[PDB]
Design a protein around this nucleic acid. Structure first.
Lengths: 65, 114, 154, 160, 53
RNA sequence: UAUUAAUCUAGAGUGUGGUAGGGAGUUUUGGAAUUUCAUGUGGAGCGGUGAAAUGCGUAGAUAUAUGAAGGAACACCAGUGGCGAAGGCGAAAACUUAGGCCAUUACUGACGCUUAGGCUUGAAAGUGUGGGGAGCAAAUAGGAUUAGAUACCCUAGUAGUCCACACCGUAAACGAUAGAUACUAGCUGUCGGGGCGAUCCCCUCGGUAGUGAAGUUAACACAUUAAGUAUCUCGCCUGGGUAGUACAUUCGCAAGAAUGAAACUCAAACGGAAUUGACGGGGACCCGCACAAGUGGUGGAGCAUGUUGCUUAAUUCGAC
């Protein structure tokens, strides 16, 4: 699960945290639900919005490779 | 042609299609389930899907290719029967390229059967 | 619905000690007795031994082993357009079907010598020509055609 | 307790339709008596399957209701080691108004009986001294051994 | 999947990958009520939950 | 009880700090889809249900790849999750705005409840306008079972759709449950904060599914996430059909908004919950040559008796 919940910051943003993203993201470029990611609920929405931005940012593909 | 061209295999439950395209995009042969006279219900069976698979095989088994990518479009069983036919002929696979263009919400889908 | 019911076979002859031969004799027998069956068997065996020079036991076991089928078509209903799923045959059923095929193709025909009828039946079952080998071929062909039906169970 | 100080007991408990109505248990004790008297004659002389059937009826007696052999009435006090384990022994006894002693462990009111005992027996080290102290609190009446009432005797043992 | 060359390992994962692709394509290949369109996913999740807590 | 001056602050918020969320009006791009058009290939098919046909293709269709493009909305992200006036909220981003939640030993001095009247939005379908129409699409055209297939099956296919103005005003808008005040066991957990504390476990308050005792009840069952208890107001129902029928009202280009009978009938509500049955194109279940396998066997003949039929005095009569 995320280091952010283990340190305390109550938010995350795309500072190229791709490493931990690869733990939350399957190699299929699809966002696993809250169960796999391990966030509580708040860092869950934070990583959700970050992954969606990365989709928009082209950091992560939607499905196209 | 080159040892690694393109094989577009659009696997659909109804009349799976397949065609060997050049890297520039020019085909060399093609087939679809029911090519040998099975268009109807019996093309949708794995028998005619495998028939089309082996037809495009025998039209591509002599192209310099020994390991070829599978550009499977859609999700079904034409992929599995094509891989089985290729493996029974001694030709290995490099990757199952899932070529499904996942719906990005463009054209309106056809409505469900009433 | 019964899942297990033990079968039974009958006592062999004290010359060759084979249950298969008395089973085939007792299924091709007519009028209840072995008498005319014994006469027809003696005639068929003479007409066999005058040709196809080979040990009778070896030729008979070759015929019986090659006759045996490989598949079984137990009906299965889709509840729409029903499509059946093939199954397997136990060895006792294999032998039983073999002998019953021999009986039904050796009982009634329109050629002259029935002695020769059973003679030709045995010899052309031995030489792998189509008499009951085609049964194995078609029971394999049906399973080949039922490959899609046996793929998914409903 | 049954092998040291007892007047009547039941193997597990009442199975229902047996406590608030002892007719089904008076006939049970009478049929036990008559079954012993009748089976005293059965000596494998008619059918061995049938004498095994009779021994199995005896076995079912010990399992379901082997304890009801000497109780000819309805007991004035009924021990309940758990209100969630003695459904019939609590419910049928509470249909009438006989005094009842029960425990209360984790999920019930302590006021469902006459005298209140919040003690427990699920713990391995509890039921030992609990049962010994309950037994030796009544065993003195019948001029029978009493070794846990004020004596330093005690047990520290796991459940077995 | 994207890769498959193992004899017996990758096929089992490919099965669930194909199932996931089918579930994802069975909501936009044909237009329908969004009610059942989300109810299918919710029921799949609920069935997967209670079977293995 | 309305209360006077002062009032008391325990509420309404509000000084302040922390503060999470798909809250939202507004504005941006990105992913690609989709089908085409320039491009070439290529040999023989496409369409599909239970099976096919309607319907497409050598004058090059399938399929193909990049280039370029129209409308169009954003797989997953989607939870003992949160934010939500309802309706709802998720490719993102941000302007703005709203609601909070936790805590403030605090203030006006309780300054608030419902809502006549007034105000507001309102899923979605659809409408005039201007534009767009990518895509599917009713009605259906044609075709498949058919006794009918009009509903259910397939293709061709336009209204429709779509962007904004104006009109939409209803939904099974529900929590089958309008609220507001005050109070009331718990628990597995979990969410937002105050958090000691790798995260934690652990809690404080609000929330999020269930739980079961009181309580509640026609029963369903609810139960501190009441169908529990008391305080204040707006909406409704007095048996059913009639009965939303007719008039009329206000607005809406109209569909619709609300509203509502009479006459009559019946003595009942397709009135509800609950018990087992029948029941199913719902499942678990054990069973008998009943099937699965076969011998023979009748519908097959010589045929003989037997049924109907007929004839007739009855071709008795009953038996199906």
């Amino acid at each position: 699960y995320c280091r952010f919940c283990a340190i305390g910051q109550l938010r995350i943003d795309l500072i190229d945290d791709l490493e931990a993203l690869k733990r939350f993201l399957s190699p299929y470029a699809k966002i696993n639900p809250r169960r796999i990611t391990g966030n509580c609920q708040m860092h869950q929405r934070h990583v959700a919005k970050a992954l969606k931005r990365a989709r928009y940012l082209a950091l992560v593909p939607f499905v196209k490779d | 042609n080159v040892s690694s061209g393109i094989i577009h295999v659009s696997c659909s439950p109804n009349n799976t299609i397949v065609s060997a395209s050049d890297p520039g995009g020019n085909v060399l042969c093609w087939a679809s389930s029911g090519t040998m006279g099975f268009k109807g219900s019996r093309k949708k069976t794995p028998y005619s899907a495998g028939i089309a698979a082996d037809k495009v095989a025998k039209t591509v088994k002599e192209m310099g290719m020994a390991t070829v990518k599978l550009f499977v479009k859609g999700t079904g069983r034409g992929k599995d029967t094509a891989i089985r036919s290729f493996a029974n002929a001694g030709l290995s696979i490099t990757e199952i390229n899932e070529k499904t263009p996942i719906p990005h919400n463009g054209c309106k889908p056809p409505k469900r059967p009433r | 619905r019964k899942n297990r019911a033990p079968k039974r076979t009958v006592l062999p002859d004290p010359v060759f000690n084979n249950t298969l031969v008395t089973r085939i004799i007792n299924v091709i027998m007519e009028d209840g007795k072995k008498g005319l069956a014994q006469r027809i068997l003696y005639g068929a065996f003479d007409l066999i031994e005058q040709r196809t020079k080979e040990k009778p036991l070896t030729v008979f076991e070759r015929a019986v082993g090659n006759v045996m089928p490989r598949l079984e078509l137990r009906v299965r209903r889709i509840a729409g357009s029903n499509y059946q799923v093939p199954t397997e045959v136990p060895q006792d059923r294999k032998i039983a079907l073999a002998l019953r095929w021999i009986a039904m193709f050796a009982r009634k025909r329109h050629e002259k010598t029935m002695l020769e009828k059973i003679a030709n039946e045995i010899i052309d079952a031995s030489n792998n020509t189509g008499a009951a080998i085609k049964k194995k071929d078609d029971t394999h062909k049906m399973a080949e055609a039922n490959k899609a039906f046996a793929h998914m169970r409903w | 307790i049954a092998k040291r100080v007892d007047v009547a007991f039941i193997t597990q408990r009442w199975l229902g339709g047996t406590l608030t109505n002892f007719k089904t248990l008076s006939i049970s004790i009478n049929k036990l008596n008559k079954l012993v008297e009748k089976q005293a004659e059965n000596a494998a002389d008619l059918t061995k399957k049938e004498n095994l059937m009779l021994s199995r009826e005896i076995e079912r007696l010990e399992k379901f209701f082997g304890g009801v052999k000497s109780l000819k009435r309805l007991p004035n006090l009924l021990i309940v080691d758990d209100p969630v384990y003695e459904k019939n022994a609590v419910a049928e006894a509470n249909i009438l108004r006989i005094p009842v002693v029960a425990l209360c462990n984790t999920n019930t009111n302590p006021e469902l009986v006459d005298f209140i005992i919040p003690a427990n027996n699920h713990q391995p080290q509890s039921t030992c001294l609990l049962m010994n102290l309950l037994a030796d609190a009544v065993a003195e009446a019948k001029a029978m051994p009493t070794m846990f009432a004020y004596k330093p005797d005690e047990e520290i043992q796991i459940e077995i | 999947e994207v890769k498959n060359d193992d004899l017996e390992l990758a096929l089992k994962k490919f099965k669930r990958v194909s199932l996931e692709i089918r579930r994802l394509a069975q909501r936009h290949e044909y237009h329908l009520r969004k009610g059942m369109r989300l109810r299918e996913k919710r029921k799949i999740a609920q069935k997967k939950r209670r079977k293995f807590r």
